Amino acid sequence: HHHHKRKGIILAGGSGTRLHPATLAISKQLLPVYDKPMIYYPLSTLMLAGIREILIISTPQDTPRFQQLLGDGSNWGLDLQYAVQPSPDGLAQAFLIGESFIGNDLSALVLGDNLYYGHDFHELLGSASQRQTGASVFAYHVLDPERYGVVEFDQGGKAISLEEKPLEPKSNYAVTGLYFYDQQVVDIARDLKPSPRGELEITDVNRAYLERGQLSVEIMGRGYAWLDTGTHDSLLEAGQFIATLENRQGLKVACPEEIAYRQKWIDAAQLEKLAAPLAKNGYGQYLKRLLTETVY
Amino acid sequence: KRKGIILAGGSGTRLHPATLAISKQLLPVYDKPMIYYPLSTLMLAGIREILIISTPQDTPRFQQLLGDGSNWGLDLQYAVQPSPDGLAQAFLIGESFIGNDLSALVLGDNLYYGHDFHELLGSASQRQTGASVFAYHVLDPERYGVVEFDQGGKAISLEEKPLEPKSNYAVTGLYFYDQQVVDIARDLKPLEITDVNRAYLERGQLSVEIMGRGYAWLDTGTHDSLLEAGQFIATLENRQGLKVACPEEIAYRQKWIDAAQLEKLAAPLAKNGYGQYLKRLLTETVY
Amino acid sequence: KRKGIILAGGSGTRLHPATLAISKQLLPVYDKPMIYYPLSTLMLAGIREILIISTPQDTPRFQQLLGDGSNWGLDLQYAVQPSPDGLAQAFLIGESFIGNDLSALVLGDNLYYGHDFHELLGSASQRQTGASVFAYHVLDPERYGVVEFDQGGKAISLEEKPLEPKSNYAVTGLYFYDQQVVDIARDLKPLEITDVNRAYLERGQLSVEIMGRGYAWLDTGTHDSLLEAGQFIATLENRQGLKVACPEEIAYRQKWIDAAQLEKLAAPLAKNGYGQYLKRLLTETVY
Amino acid sequence: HHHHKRKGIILAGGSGTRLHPATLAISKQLLPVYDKPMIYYPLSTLMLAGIREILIISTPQDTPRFQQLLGDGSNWGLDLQYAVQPSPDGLAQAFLIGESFIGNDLSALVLGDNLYYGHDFHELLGSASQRQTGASVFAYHVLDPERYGVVEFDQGGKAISLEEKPLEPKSNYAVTGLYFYDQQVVDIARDLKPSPRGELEITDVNRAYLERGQLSVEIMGRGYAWLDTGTHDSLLEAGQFIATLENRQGLKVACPEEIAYRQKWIDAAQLEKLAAPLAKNGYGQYLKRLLTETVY
Ligand SMILES: CN(c1c(N)n(Cc2cccc(F)c2)c(=O)[nH]c1=O)S(=O)(=O)c1ccccc1
Ligand SMILES: CN(c1c(N)n(Cc2cccc(F)c2)c(=O)[nH]c1=O)S(=O)(=O)c1ccccc1
Ligand SMILES: CN(c1c(N)n(Cc2cccc(F)c2)c(=O)[nH]c1=O)S(=O)(=O)c1ccccc1
Ligand SMILES: CN(c1c(N)n(Cc2cccc(F)c2)c(=O)[nH]c1=O)S(=O)(=O)c1ccccc1
Ligand SMILES: [Cl-]
Ligand SMILES: [Cl-]
Ligand SMILES: [Cl-]
Ligand SMILES: [Cl-]
């Protein structure tokens, strides 16, 4: 081989019956958060990390639905591919399903229902996606660490343990649903055994990187918003939250077309074409306004 | 007897991109799909035979969600509206479904809440001739059909989206009609529901009941208003430990389905709050 | 005749630091002070003579806000509760104010909304003997006085904050009493409102009306619930272009103040939406 | 004189009748935003800028009320003083009223009803308060620039004009209610004439710095939240917004006691005393928890 890059996975899996009957009609990661489908937020997050090649993993039923919404990604300067998860057998299963898509590249996994907002978010992802060996994750102070993977730090701020959904959390630092990996992850994933719960656990993957001294745990500070989209009540909170930012600023959070245009993955002419069929609503108007406004 | 029509029509691109993935009247308002609210309204009016009209794209969706209704003691049929050519078009599309019966039309994105709502609908469905509509005081009557009243409280004019509204009373998206409505609908020229209602008013056959300020009438037309409606329902539901517009519950309380059938519908939802709630309805007395 | 008591008692430190700067029942729920809601409730029950009971710190505040009531056609008096020693203490403090009349007690942080609320209070104020209270279905009956009903819907027990509630029916913070309540209150031992109500129940003189699910009963006890109540009122108000619990409007519609007096009250508020609204009430018919 | 600092002003003025009747009972900047009084947010902002000597300007009626809430500031390691504004004759009046308090020091003015949130907010204020000459302001993209002082930028991103409440804004960049000044501001303030509106305008002050080439205009990016507290509807939005962050994180935004403790203006023993009278509620519990939890 002669030499002369990082791929993305969004896991937009089966949310069971927990949100029924809202989710009988459609899958969770197609429900909107305010003005746009849920999937637009993690997708925008990957794009902001600089990732253009992305694998959307969803149920067999829902795959066609995501495909229709997003296509191959070519209109936004992306290359989207699709795969199915027959059964919700754990988040780490994404690496077995995604094996051939990853190939010998670096990867990044994002949960389909994870929403992030804040200043210099681009720069915080930059430093994770720039480290070419090991794994990088983010830890975020929360009220209810029991629901997540919890990181324990020593007095020097070094990460020393990881626990999935501990009943007695060692700290309030939760592992967020955004993960960066080197080429070792597929092989670490293949050697995992199901948990007592029947799942291939992402925390087991991260524990394996930690055990080799190859796990970077960056803090995502309190000045960032990491929102919960797990309940009816939290989905509603996230909507309110985005609407308040958007109506205050006259700017959008996680508008993929805008992110593609600012990254130079699409040009002015292409952005204008995408604005055309949306011209009679606020979203298309906003795309048009981006052609002529300078936004710092 | 009285049949129902839910018009769950084409919202265009106005709510894109939320609506690229799915039609509007399938978006949830808090914990359930939008369509559940007007459907519940019809059920509360005592109507079991109901026509769901939607776009060609969305009609199969609503079918796939709701089926023939038989699990909730209903009889649901489906029809398509090729182009959003006005709300009155429901009566042409719905012609053969209505047959020679009385009808009721409800808008697919109209949400109602309040005390004795069952009784308020009762009096409208009970009037066997003419048409019945409801007027509700709003901030922005320009968006709606506006009713003008004389000093005696008699309705004397109707205007669709007037630039200078004569009053702040808006016509809500719930309409009751006799057997004349199909023929009135056929004779309309370019297709407004306000024209239909104006024809009933011109013959002295339009009842305009006030829906008082103690009732909530919410519009799910915008991203902002959809979010308002969610907050509103969630606050009521979490306060009461009771649901608003749960079709299964309405069917059970109307005796259109029995305890055994309710239990079967609770089964596949058992692992979430909605199924638990259906189960709890078998054993709790709720006044 | 029936007198009113608003208990606007000491919230302790539980809402600090919001409440360091001012008492709770002066915090606004959306556009108006909290106290306006229970006050409006009493006015809607037809009660004009009202005792406001609060802490020593906060009583002068409520006085300075509301005065003697004469601008709204009311007669407001004030009294203090030195220590938050239970809601039933209102009747000892309020003894000489009540005199030999019938009474009504409302909690200072209780918010009610819905259709025909005037009529529901009417039937309670109209019963001249015994006591009347309202039961409302809630998610968390542990926080309240809980009513247990038999299979015939008769009330058979009352429990204050039981760990194992017998039903989900909570007693709301609105109470109507005959002339027996002062003497029942004096004979209580360490001072619960549920004990007072239990004494009426034990003599077969407690009416427990259901406040149905079509009514909203909101609690303003927490930061979270205060915020919920704000959202809820704002959504109704911005939808309707009408206010909930505007005392001036209630006084005007009850004929306790006239058009001229309403106009004077609109004057100093003219440059904001609230004064504009009072002005608009002089000329708009609202059903 | 022998040599061997920056003072703050919070303008918490008369909001007229615009929010009546909510504001009949009490002044605006004492209304809570969620769990805490409004004044706590701009105060926390000054503290985060490193400012300990602060002048609270309010109406004659409301002064005693702020005083009771906040005292002399000594419990939080601050030195708070108070002054009255007899009539709401414009924001720039703060420098005439504050003349003797400012003396020959550098200053910072913050509006009493301005709420800010985001990542590295400390660092963004640091670079403004660190510049010892000229003035520094912040520009923030909004939907409704008409309501504010608007900044116009040239193609190189240089600020070239300032307009107060223009009916036809030149950009969507609004000047936020946070201002840093050198020793020239009192004298610039003294030479101002009332506007057509009867007000001593802050924008006139800022225009004078601009005209001498001494106005730094830093962008406050979209990843920051700058919230509106001007209406009943916006006050409610700000509450929802703070509550969603706080309940998600189990951390507080603009808790002055926490900011004083992290700045080392008060010690562990002092923080424990302040937690005592609040022990039976969530706020005091949170102060206590800060003594033992490491928070990054
Ligand atoms: C507010 N954020 C954001 C931005 N910061 N930006 C500016 C941007 C765009 C492309 C590349 C950049 F480096 C910065 C956007 O164009 N859209 C955004 O939503 S964000 O970084 O917090 C964010 C990005 C993606 C998904 C969620 C939040
Ligand atoms: C809160 N409401 C309500 C009720 N009052 N009821 C009880 C009910 C059911 C059938 C007949 C009745 F009279 C009362 C419900 O079972 N579900 C409800 O959502 S409502 O009448 O205002 C309503 C009905 C239909 C759709 C939305 C709200
Ligand atoms: C929406 N409601 C309401 C009204 N229905 N009315 C109209 C009114 C006034 C006096 C007597 C009436 F029957 C009706 C009001 O004038 N103000 C109101 O807030 S309410 O009856 O549910 C209510 C009354 C008192 C306090 C809060 C809500
Ligand atoms: C979330 N923010 C914040 C923080 N970032 N911090 C951490 C902190 C405290 C003191 C000094 C620091 F450099 C950082 C806090 O202790 N409390 C806070 O509210 S903030 O910077 O966006 C903020 C600070 C003051 C007022 C409003 C927001
Ligand atoms: Cl931060
Ligand atoms: Cl009503
Ligand atoms: Cl009811
Ligand atoms: Cl930013």
State the chains in contact with C (3 or more Cβ–Cβ pairs under 8 Å): B, D
The span from the CA of A216 to the CA of A144, in Å, is: 23
Strand-pairing partners, residue C80, are C54
- Ligand 2, atom 21, residue with closest C-alpha: B117
Strand-pairing partners, residue C158, are C147
Do the Cβ atoms of A296 and D223 come within 8 Å? no
Note whether D10 and D46 are within 8 A (CB).
yes
For chain B, the residue count is 287
Q: Where in the sequence is the domain holding C253, given as residue range(s)?
A: 1-287
Report the residue from D157, D223, D251 with minimal CB separation from A119: D223
Q: How many helices (H) and strands (E) does chain A have?
A: 12, 13
- DSSP code, position A197: T
The span from the CA of A240 to the CA of A246, in Å, is: 10
The span from the CA of D37 to the CA of C17, in Å, is: 7
Q: Count CB-CB contacts under 10 A for residue A119.
A: 23
Q: How far is CA A194 from CA A83, A163, A176, A204, B37, in A?
A: 21, 15, 21, 10, 42
The span from the CA of C201 to the CA of C208, in Å, is: 9
3-state secondary structure at position A85? coil
Give me the phi and psi of B170, to 5 degrees please: -100, 145
Do the Cβ atoms of B116 and C115 come within 8 Å? yes
Q: How far is CA D194 from CA A28, A273, D108, in A?
A: 57, 50, 22
Distant-in-sequence contacts of A276-279, Cβ < 8 A, 24+ apart: A277/B13, A278/B13, A278/B16, A278/B17
Pull the structure tokens for residue C48: 């004009």
3-state secondary structure at position B57? coil
Note whether A45 and A254 are within 8 A (CB).
yes
Taking contacts as CB-CB distances below 8 angstroms, the residues of chain D near A35 are none
To which H or E segment does residue C259 belong? helix C259-266
The span from the CA of A253 to the CA of A125, in Å, is: 16
CA angle A95, A96, A101 (to 5 degrees): 70
Note whether A181 and A100 are within 8 A (CB).
no
The span from the CA of B220 to the CA of B106, in Å, is: 13
The span from the CA of A67 to the CA of A63, in Å, is: 6
Handedness of CA C65, C70, C74, C77 (dihedral sign): positive
Strand-pairing partners, residue A58, are A12, A84
The set of residues, in sequence order, having a beta carbon less than 8 Å from that of B2 and lying 6+ positions away, is B45, B46, B47, B101, B102, B103, B104, B125, B176
Torsion from C-alpha of B21, B27, B32, B34, nearest 10 degrees: -140
Interface test with C, best of D23, D24, D44, D286 (most C CBs within 10 A): D24
The span from the CA of C51 to the CA of C68, in Å, is: 10
Instruction: Decide: A85 in ligand 1 pocket, CB within 6 A.
Output: no
Note whether D212 and D132 are within 8 A (CB).
no
Strand-pairing partners, residue A53, are A79
The half-sphere exposure of A98 on its side-chain side, counting CA atoms within 13 A, is: 30
The half-sphere exposure of D222 on its side-chain side, counting CA atoms within 13 A, is: 19
Distant-in-sequence contacts of D128-132, Cβ < 8 A, 24+ apart: D128/D49, D128/D180, D128/D216, D128/D218, D129/D6, D129/D49, D129/D50, D129/D51, D129/D180, D131/D180, D131/D216, D132/D106, D132/D182
Handedness of CA A85, A91, A96, A102 (dihedral sign): positive
The set of residues, in sequence order, having a beta carbon less than 8 Å from that of D244 and lying 6+ positions away, is A227, A237, A240, A241
Pull the structure tokens for residue A234: 């939290």
Instruction: Decide: D213 in ligand 1 pocket, CB within 6 A.
Output: no
The span from the CA of D110 to the CA of C247, in Å, is: 36
Residue with tokens 């009220």: A143
Instruction: Decide: A290 in ligand 1 pocket, CB within 6 A.
Output: no
Note whether A176 and A225 are within 8 A (CB).
no
Report the residue from A18, A35, A233 with minimal CB separation from B18: A35
Q: Count CB-CB contacts under 10 A for residue A279.
A: 12
Do the Cβ atoms of A248 and D240 come within 8 Å? no
3-state secondary structure at position A113? coil
Taking contacts as CB-CB distances below 8 angstroms, the residues of chain B near A280 are 12-14
Residues 222-251 of B with CB under 8 A from C: 228, 231-232, 235-236, 238-242
Note whether D244 and D255 are within 8 A (CB).
no
**Looking at the 3D structure of chain C, how many domains does it have?**
1
The span from the CA of D72 to the CA of A150, in Å, is: 42
To which H or E segment does residue C208 belong? strand C206-210
The span from the CA of B231 to the CA of B245, in Å, is: 15
Pull the structure tokens for residue A19: 């949100």
Note whether A260 and A77 are within 8 A (CB).
yes
Q: How far is CA D230 from CA B29, D18, D28, D148, D238, in A?
A: 29, 9, 9, 12, 10
The span from the CA of D34 to the CA of D291, in Å, is: 24
Do the Cβ atoms of D172 and A237 come within 8 Å? no
3-state secondary structure at position B255? coil
Strands (DSSP E) found in chain A: 6-12, 32-33, 36-37, 53-58, 79-84, 106-111, 115-117, 135-141, 149-153, 159-164, 173-181, 215-219, 225-227
Do the Cβ atoms of C115 and B114 come within 8 Å? yes
Can you list the alpha helix ranges (DSSP code H) found in C67-212?
Answer: 90-93, 95-98, 117-126, 181-186, 193-202
R_g of chain C computed on alpha carbons:
19
Query: By C-alpha distance, which of C24, C72, C263 is closest to D25?
Result: C24
Amino acid at A215: L
Å between B133 CA and nearest CA of chain C: 15
Can you list the alpha helix ranges (DSSP code H) found in C55-177?
Answer: 59-66, 90-93, 95-98, 117-126
Note whether B50 and B5 are within 8 A (CB).
yes
Strand-pairing partners, residue B264, are none
> Which atom of ligand 2 has the smallest separation from the CA of B254?
10
Taking contacts as CB-CB distances below 8 angstroms, the residues of chain A near B268 are 17
Amino acid at C141: P
Instruction: Decide: B30 in ligand 2 pocket, CB within 6 A.
Output: no
Instruction: Decide: B253 in ligand 2 pocket, CB within 6 A.
Output: yes
Interface test with B, best of A40, A61, A236, A240 (most B CBs within 10 A): A236
The span from the CA of D22 to the CA of D34, in Å, is: 15
Q: Count CB-CB contacts under 10 A for residue C186.
A: 11
The span from the CA of C44 to the CA of D162, in Å, is: 53
The span from the CA of D91 to the CA of D82, in Å, is: 16
Instruction: Tell me whether strands D79-84 and D53-58 are parallel, antiparallel or unpaired.
Output: parallel
3-state secondary structure at position D176? strand
Residue with tokens 């305010």: A34
**A96/B contact by beta carbon, under 8 A:** no
Note whether B214 and C113 are within 8 A (CB).
yes
Instruction: Tell me whether strands B2-8 and B49-54 are parallel, antiparallel or unpaired.
Output: parallel
- DSSP code, position D22: H
φ/ψ bin of D120: left (φ > 0), alpha (ψ from -120 to 50), beta (otherwise): left
Can you list the alpha helix ranges (DSSP code H) found in chain D?
Answer: 22-25, 40-48, 63-70, 94-97, 99-102, 121-130, 185-190, 202-211, 232-249, 256-262, 268-275, 282-292
**B115/A contact by beta carbon, under 8 A:** no
Pull the structure tokens for residue A153: 């730090």
For chain C, the residue count is 287
Q: How distant is the alpha carbon of residue A137 from its chain centre? A: 12
The span from the CA of C53 to the CA of D229, in Å, is: 32
**C28/D contact by beta carbon, under 8 A:** yes
DSSP string, D127-164: HHHH--SSEEEEEEE-S-GGGSEEEEE-TTS-EEEEEE
Residue A7, exposed/middle/buried by CB under 10 A (0-12, 13-18, 19+)? Answer: buried
Can you list the alpha helix ranges (DSSP code H) found in D164-229?
Answer: 185-190, 202-211
Q: Count CB-CB contacts under 10 A for residue A143.
A: 14
Query: By C-alpha distance, which of B216, B248, B215 is closest to B232?
Result: B216
Instruction: Decide: C131 in ligand 3 pocket, CB within 6 A.
Output: no
The span from the CA of D235 to the CA of D223, in Å, is: 20
> Which atom of ligand 4 has the smallest separation from the CA of D262?
10
Closest-approaching ligand to the CA atom of C46: 3
Answer whether the bond into residue D32 is a cis peptide, omega within 30°: no
Answer whether the bond into residue B17 is a cis peptide, omega within 30°: yes
Pull the structure tokens for residue B63: 């079918």
Query: By C-alpha distance, which of C262, C14, C112, A296 is closest to D171?
Result: A296
Strands (DSSP E) found in B182-272: 206-210, 216-219
Strands (DSSP E) found in B68-130: 75-80, 102-107, 110-113
Give me the phi and psi of B169, to 5 degrees please: -90, 115
The span from the CA of D67 to the CA of D61, in Å, is: 11
- CA of C71 from ligand 4 middle (Å) equals 47
Torsion from C-alpha of B205, B206, B207, B212, nearest 10 degrees: -170
**D213/A contact by beta carbon, under 8 A:** no
Torsion from C-alpha of B47, B53, B58, B60, nearest 10 degrees: 70
The span from the CA of B199 to the CA of C5, in Å, is: 53
- DSSP code, position D98: T
Residue C156, exposed/middle/buried by CB under 10 A (0-12, 13-18, 19+)? Answer: exposed
Pull the structure tokens for residue C80: 């203090």
Amino acid at A294: T
Strand-pairing partners, residue C134, are C209
The set of residues, in sequence order, having a beta carbon less than 8 Å from that of C119 and lying 6+ positions away, is none
The span from the CA of D114 to the CA of D45, in Å, is: 9
Do the Cβ atoms of D143 and A250 come within 8 Å? yes
CATH classification at residue D87: 3.90.550.10
Answer whether the bond into residue C141 is a cis peptide, omega within 30°: no
Q: Count CB-CB contacts under 10 A for residue D190.
A: 12
Q: Count CB-CB contacts under 10 A for residue D171.
A: 17
Strand-pairing partners, residue D233, are none
Amino acid at D11: L
Give me the phi and psi of A271, to 5 degrees please: -60, -40
Amino acid at A92: A
The set of residues, in sequence order, having a beta carbon less than 8 Å from that of A89 and lying 6+ positions away, is A194, A198, A199, A200
The set of residues, in sequence order, having a beta carbon less than 8 Å from that of B88 and lying 6+ positions away, is B185, B188, B191, B192, B193, B195, B196
The span from the CA of D136 to the CA of D233, in Å, is: 30
Answer whether the bond into residue D21 is a cis peptide, omega within 30°: yes
Over A92-106, what HEC string results? HHHHHHCHHHHCCCE
Q: Count CB-CB contacts under 10 A for residue C43.
A: 24
Query: By C-alpha distance, which of D203, D174, D177 is closest to D188?
Result: D203
Note whether A185 and A238 are within 8 A (CB).
no
The span from the CA of A270 to the CA of A261, in Å, is: 9
Q: Count CB-CB contacts under 10 A for residue D56.
A: 26
Do the Cβ atoms of A283 and B234 come within 8 Å? no
Note whether A46 and A122 are within 8 A (CB).
no
To which H or E segment does residue B175 belong? strand B169-177
